[PDB]
């Protein structure tokens, strides 16, 4: 607030520093969101051109962001308990209820990663092997933000396809994360974003 | 869309750092995504701890991402060669003509001479 | 001390007599910063505050 920052600036100018200091005009910090779903099923690929990630982004519901932010539901919950929590009051499909991977720009952040891949469920052990790197790519992408370097909130990121290289190792050891960041930014930009 | 941006983060040049594998990337991309990987993320090659070379986020006598000796635009479009030991990056043909004819491995006026085998490809 | 006055209040002589913060392409204006905010929160809205007394808040 104004009084809080006035006290901080008075303590900066009079106590911890004797330096004359220019102060800019106050502004706020914004966030980035979406309104309508991704009209184009956007995708990207690794620098070793074998893995191909196709993912679309759509906005969440009304109470979901404040339910995550007030820690009503957590990633430390049971998968069945989390699926029941989604299914009873949000009417989600149980396939979609078991599809939830990660939350937000941080822990209990207001974004939801959902993995819905039918041709990539035949190598779902390899999908679970690359799932953690997909998670840190999602955390980095929603923490940074492509629009004006602000946080991203109230977005469900729905994975459509994951062409994972069979036993990637050398290419699946750090190239997955910036690919996932580019996937998150490209899926966010194709879904009419708002401040 | 050009090659002047970072390879991994797909962002423009702000605080770039080079590597001994021939690829220069963002310092935040090299720090967070290769904190314990120990390998070059451009092609999966092994990268040492001292193999990375800093190129920005400090004081330079050129003031831009240009040739430090030739004082011309040694950007991603131009053939740019960087000194591995010194950290200065110039145009490849200008540094080759300087260090070939008059053996001018130094700067234009700072006069920092070195060997001719420390030049590597930046990108 | 700031050489600025409310129209109801008195006026005095001045006491003491490029910035990129004043760049017009980086400043969002919705409400203009009037004199009253520079008096009520004088360390916030004023560059170089000297011999400034903090006012009493709400009672």
């Amino acid at each position: 607030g104004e009084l809080y920052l006035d006290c901080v600036m008075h303590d900066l100018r009079k106590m911890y520093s004797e330096i004359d200091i220019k102060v800019a005009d106050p502004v706020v910090t914004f966030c980035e969101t979406v309104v309508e779903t991704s009209s184009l099923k956007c995708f990207a690929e690794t620098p070793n051109k074998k893995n191909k990630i196709t993912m679309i982004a759509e906005p969440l519901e009304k109470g979901l962001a404040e339910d995550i932010e007030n820690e009503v539901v957590q990633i430390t919950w049971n998968r069945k308990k989390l699926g029941e929590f989604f299914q009873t009051k949000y009417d989600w499909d149980l396939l979609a209820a078991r599809s939830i991977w990660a939350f937000g720009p941080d822990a209990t952040g207001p974004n939801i990663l959902v993995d819905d891949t039918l041709p990539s469920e035949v190598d779902k052990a390899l999908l679970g092997s690359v799932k953690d790197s997909i998670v840190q790519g999602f955390q980095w992408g929603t923490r940074e933000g492509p629009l004006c370097d602000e946080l991203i909130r109230n977005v469900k990121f729905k994975i459509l396809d994951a062409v994972v290289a069979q036993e990637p190792l050398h290419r699946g050891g750090g190239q997955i994360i910036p690919t996932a960041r580019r996937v998150v930014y490209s899926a966010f930009l194709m879904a009419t974003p708002r401040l | 869309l050009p090659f002047d941006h970072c390879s991994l983060s797909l962002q423009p040049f702000v605080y770039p750092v080079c590597t001994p594998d021939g690829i220069v990337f963002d310092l935040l991309n090299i720090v967070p995504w290769l904190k314990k990987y120990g390998t070059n993320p451009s092609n999966g090659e092994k990268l040492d701890g001292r193999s990375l070379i800093k190129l920005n986020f400090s004081k330079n006598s050129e003031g831009k991402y240009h040739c430090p000796v030739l004082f011309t635009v040694f950007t991603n479009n131009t053939h740019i060669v960087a000194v591995r030991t010194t950290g200065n990056v110039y145009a490849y043909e200008a540094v080759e003509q300087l260090n070939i004819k008059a053996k001018n491995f130094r700067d234009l006026l700072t006069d920092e001479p070195f060997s001719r085998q420390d030049i590597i490809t930046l990108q | 001390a700031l050489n600025m006055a409310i129209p109801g209040g008195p006026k005095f002589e001045p006491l003491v007599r490029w910035n990129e913060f004043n760049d017009i392409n980086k400043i969002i204006i919705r409400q203009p910063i009037r004199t009253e905010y520079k008096i009520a929160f004088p360390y916030l809205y004023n560059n170089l505050p000297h011999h400034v007394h903090l006012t009493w808040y709400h009672t």
Binding site: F30, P146, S186, L189 | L10 | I28
Partner: peptide
């Protein structure tokens, strides 16, 4: 006015910290 507000906040924030131009297909 109201329809120009998000464009103004976008342009002024990007001039404050980053780059002015924004490309929708800047990654792909």
């Amino acid at each position: 006015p109201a329809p120009h507000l998000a464009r103004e906040f976008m342009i002024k924030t990007r001039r404050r910290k980053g780059l002015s131009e924004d490309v929708s297909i800047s990654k792909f």
